[PDB]
Design a protein around this motif. Structure first.
Motif, mmCIF file in Angstrom:
data_model
loop_
_atom_site.group_PDB
_atom_site.id
_atom_site.type_symbol
_atom_site.label_atom_id
_atom_site.label_comp_id
_atom_site.label_asym_id
_atom_site.label_seq_id
_atom_site.Cartn_x
_atom_site.Cartn_y
_atom_site.Cartn_z
ATOM 1 N N UNK A 124 0.808 -1.217 0.000
ATOM 2 C CA UNK A 124 0.000 0.000 0.000
ATOM 3 C C UNK A 124 0.844 1.271 0.000
ATOM 4 N N UNK A 146 -2.114 -8.204 -7.677
ATOM 5 C CA UNK A 146 -3.394 -7.782 -8.261
ATOM 6 C C UNK A 146 -3.219 -6.922 -9.501
ATOM 7 N N UNK A 155 -0.209 -0.709 -13.307
ATOM 8 C CA UNK A 155 0.600 0.483 -13.151
ATOM 9 C C UNK A 155 1.992 0.151 -13.659
ATOM 10 N N UNK A 177 -9.124 1.134 -12.997
ATOM 11 C CA UNK A 177 -7.964 1.955 -12.635
ATOM 12 C C UNK A 177 -7.292 2.656 -13.806
ATOM 13 N N UNK A 210 -7.508 8.402 -0.489
ATOM 14 C CA UNK A 210 -7.364 7.431 -1.561
ATOM 15 C C UNK A 210 -7.218 6.092 -0.850
ATOM 16 N N UNK A 268 -8.635 -0.472 1.147
ATOM 17 C CA UNK A 268 -7.479 -0.985 1.874
ATOM 18 C C UNK A 268 -7.374 -0.368 3.262
ATOM 19 N N UNK A 312 -11.296 1.212 -4.993
ATOM 20 C CA UNK A 312 -11.048 0.165 -5.965
ATOM 21 C C UNK A 312 -11.931 -1.041 -5.674
ATOM 22 N N UNK A 336 -10.145 -6.956 -5.885
ATOM 23 C CA UNK A 336 -9.190 -7.365 -6.901
ATOM 24 C C UNK A 336 -9.818 -7.377 -8.287
ATOM 25 N N UNK A 354 -11.533 -4.922 -10.179
ATOM 26 C CA UNK A 354 -11.421 -3.763 -11.079
ATOM 27 C C UNK A 354 -12.694 -3.771 -11.920
#
Lengths: 166, 650
Positions: free
Chosen positions: A28, A80, A86, B336, B388, B392, B432, B435, B437
């Protein structure tokens, strides 16, 4: 501020060995400087942002050590979709046993273990100072894209999106 | 010509020009920067209720005679406040002697009056406070975090000769209290030791207050600072932790600021004319949504929501036990690698208060008091706050955002402190889909791993999913390389895009000048907009959404069309048929029957719209009627012949 390791290495290469052996707390914070290079922390001590540039280099292994050809790469890689989405460049450095190509790797490791010298090719290995100076001289350059390369870039992007768009 | 050493201030000349400005000032700053006698009325009003304080606006700048006074009080405030105390008493007794009055001179002869100047320009906090700015006036905008209990300082002191009991009162002088050694009276002539008594001596109240500063502009790399300010008498217990406070005083030297005034409460004509001329256009509703971020893409619902989120709405309260704030807490979820973080930074570059992530009360033992010590949301008790990675985030810290969703409060119940306090701004959170998306084979309420109780209470959600295809992402790549076509974007000005400096001025004028009311006339369209999601948090979100729609376009009364788009908003933010062909078929059959039943075929489209849709319920799509008449144009059933008359075939 006493940053883990992302704060003493501000402008440079931050490397991670054994990427899948970490936890969610490391991931994270790695994803946050991977997307935007500005860690922000808001705890009872401070609510501040530390900005650093780190070309994240990562070294990882799959779930069962080596690869699996019967398994999909989304299932072979435990990371993931937002992490490798990214990641622009992922290198599947996979070893395949062969008859001809393995002898060159064996000859090269016996040549570097016999003596410190490199193989006799018609090229000399450059010392660290000269390409360090070349990287520092090339970093001040600001290139501008043209229109003829623009029409190739947008067509390749449209074709790549349609090909990628199971 | 009297000149003080190191001071360019003459007493009598400044006394005469201060009296000349005070006897004659009628809104000159409105003319060169209706009413009459702007300072005579306030000074003649304040003398009856006993208020000795005088709030002065440093009007002294725009005045023709006192430009040499404003340039003299910024460097030496201690001398000008001390001589202003004499001149205000002199001009007040000159006002007393001009009129017939009762015995008011018996109390004003010994009374003291002071001056609190606050109208000065801004500064860059403590960072611009160099050592040439010592003993100068300064202003700080921020929030206070800790208030030390008032400490009594002894202005005077009693002395008693313990063997003969004669009393002596001494006063202060630059911080020293001379203690007399022996008696001096005629009954106690003997030399003996005095004793100090204090429980009978007046004390000036003093208090050090912690202040978290935040300027209008902050340099790169600067952290927020904690300045220790100190208040004195008649100003103690007026400033305490929890409020956005503008403060001003004298910067001293460890450094501190000696407060002369606190402010617990809170453009030109050609710019206002340009704002009124740009507010009368129709496309402003999209123009702003295009001018808020021209480096990205469209994002109409998302950009429109963050535009009206920073517009705010209407914050109305009751007298004693009620409060309501026009506010929307937004959440973003979906695919994303798009502009999400960009927005999360852009808004941090727009608001003057916000953190990129709650606070906590503490019993400070040194001063034995309940101070507060924070950042994040607590700091932004105004503006927005950006979070953000909502999925999580832990579950233990979700309980504080569960209270700030609609209650805007902090309820701490721990060791040493049981306190509920103020904490309202608005959250902007990017999340998000676990997992996933986002998956089309799973519901929206299960794909993001977000609890229903905490998400139904959310005012606005945003499906920012990509769903990649052709003739879209091609324009995305073309717009991203169009600024790579040239090396410098100097060609960004020839498009319909407002600049940032005009936009923030229009937004700051609209947020502080418009208090729109939600009338009963928009009742009927709201009920039916609620039942479509029902076939109270959504209703509370949509009324703040409708009042923010009323906040834009310079409106004081809400209108019926303004909720239509609002609902379209919340219906699009969460998202050639055979039935459409059947709709066009029965619409063509019905329009052929109502166009051929009457004799006068010469009848336009607007009369057709008001004659076929008023005998039934709500509006059908007019573009489908345009497509049906174009279908009849292709089959030669009707003839268009202009926009003023619609006639059929012969």
């Amino acid at each position: 501020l006493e940053g883990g390791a992302l704060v003493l290495a501000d402008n440079g290469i931050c490397c991670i060995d054994e990427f899948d052996k970490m936890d969610e707390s490391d991931r994270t914070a790695i994803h946050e400087v991977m997307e935007q290079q500005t860690i922000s922390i808001s705890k009872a001590g401070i609510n501040t942002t530390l900005n650093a540039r780190t070309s994240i280099l990562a070294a990882a292994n799959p779930l069962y050590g080596r690869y699996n050809p019967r398994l999909s790469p989304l299932d072979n890689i435990n990371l993931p979709a937002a992490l490798l989405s990214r990641f622009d460049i992922l290198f599947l450095m996979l070893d395949i046993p062969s008859r001809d190509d393995d002898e060159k790797l064996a000859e090269h490791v016996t040549y570097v273990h016999m003596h410190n010298k490199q193989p006799d090719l018609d090229f000399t290995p450059v010392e660290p100072s000269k390409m360090r100076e070349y990287i520092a001289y090339a970093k001040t350059k600001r290139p501008v894209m043209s229109e003829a390369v623009n029409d190739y870039v947008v067509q390749a992007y449209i074709r790549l999106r349609q090909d990628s768009k199971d | 010509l009297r000149i003080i050493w190191g001071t360019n201030v003459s007493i009598q000349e400044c006394t005469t020009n201060f009296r000349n400005f005070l006897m004659s000032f009628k809104y000159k700053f409105r003319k060169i920067l209706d009413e009459e006698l702007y300072y005579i009325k306030q000074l003649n009003e304040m003398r009856e209720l006993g208020t000795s304080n005088l709030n002065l606006d440093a009007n002294l700048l725009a005045y023709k005679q006192t430009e040499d006074l404003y340039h003299q009080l910024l460097n030496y405030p201690q001398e000008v406040i001390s001589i202003m105390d004499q001149t205000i008493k002199d001009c007040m007794v000159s006002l007393i002697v001009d009129n017939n009055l009762d015995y008011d001179l018996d109390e004003i002869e010994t009374k003291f009056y002071k001056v609190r100047p606050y109208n000065v320009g801004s500064c860059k906090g403590m960072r611009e406070l160099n050592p040439n700015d010592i003993d100068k006036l300064i202003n700080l905008k921020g929030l206070v975090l800790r208030s030390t209990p008032v400490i009594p300082d002894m202005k005077v002191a009693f002395f008693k000769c313990n063997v003969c009991d004669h009393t002596m009162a001494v006063e202060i002088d630059r911080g020293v209290i001379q203690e007399p050694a022996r008696c001096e009276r005629i009954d106690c002539n003997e030399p003996n030791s005095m004793s100090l008594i204090h429980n009978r001596c007046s004390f000036a109240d003093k208090q050090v207050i912690k202040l978290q500063e935040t300027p209008d502009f902050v340099p790169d790399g600067q952290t927020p600072h904690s300045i220790s300010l100190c208040v004195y008498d008649e100003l103690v217990d007026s400033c305490r932790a929890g409020d956005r406070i503008e403060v001003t005083g004298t910067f001293r030297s460890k450094t501190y600021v000696d407060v002369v005034h606190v402010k617990k409460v809170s453009i030109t004509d050609q710019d206002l004319a340009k704002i009124r001329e740009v507010a009368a256009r129709e496309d402003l509703y999209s123009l702003l949504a295009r001018s808020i971020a021209p480096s990205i893409y469209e994002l109409e619902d998302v950009k429109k929501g963050i535009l009206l989120q920073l517009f705010g709405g209407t914050n109305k309260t009751f007298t004693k036990g009620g409060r309501y704030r026009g506010d929307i807490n937004i959440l973003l979820c979906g695919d994303p690698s798009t502009s999400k973080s960009q927005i999360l930074q852009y808004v941090h570059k727009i608001t003057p208060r916000g953190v990129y992530t709650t606070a906590y009360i503490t019993r400070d033992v040194d001063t034995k008091q309940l101070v507060l010590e924070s950042g994040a949301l607590v700091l932004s008790d105004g503006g927005v706050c950006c979070i953000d990675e909502f999925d999580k985030m832990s579950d233990s810290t979700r309980s504080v955002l569960h209270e700030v969703m609609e209650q805007q409060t902090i309820s701490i119940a721990k060791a040493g402190i049981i306190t509920t306090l103020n904490a309202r701004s608005s959250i902007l959170a990017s999340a998000n889909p676990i997992g996933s998306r986002y998956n089309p084979n799973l519901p929206v309420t299960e794909n993001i791993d977000l609890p229903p109780p905490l998400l139904s209470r959310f005012d606005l959600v945003y499906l920012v999913l990509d769903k990649v295809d052709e003739k879209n992402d091609r324009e995305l790549a073309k717009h991203l390389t169009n600024l790579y076509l040239e090396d410098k974007p100097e060609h960004i000005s020839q498009d319909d895009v407002l600049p940032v400096e005009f936009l923030t001025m229009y937004i700051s004028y609209a947020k502080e000048h418009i208090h729109p009311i939600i009338t009963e006339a928009a009742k009927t369209e709201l009920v039916r907009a609620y039942v479509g999601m029902r076939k109270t948090r959504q209703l509370e979100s949509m009324i703040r959404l409708a009042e923010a729609h009323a906040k834009m376009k310079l409106k004081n009364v809400v209108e019926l069309e303004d909720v239509q788009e609002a609902v379209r908003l919340i219906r699009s933010a969460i998202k050639k048929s055979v039935i459409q062909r059947k709709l066009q078929e029965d619409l063509s059959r019905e329009i052929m029957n109502v166009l051929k039943d009457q004799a006068s075929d010469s009848m336009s489209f607007n009369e057709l719209i008001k004659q076929i849709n008023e005998h039934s319920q709500d509006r059908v799509e007019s573009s489908d009627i345009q497509e049906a008449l174009s279908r009849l144009q292709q089959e030669d059933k009707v003839i268009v012949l202009g926009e003023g008359v619609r006639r059929s075939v012969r």
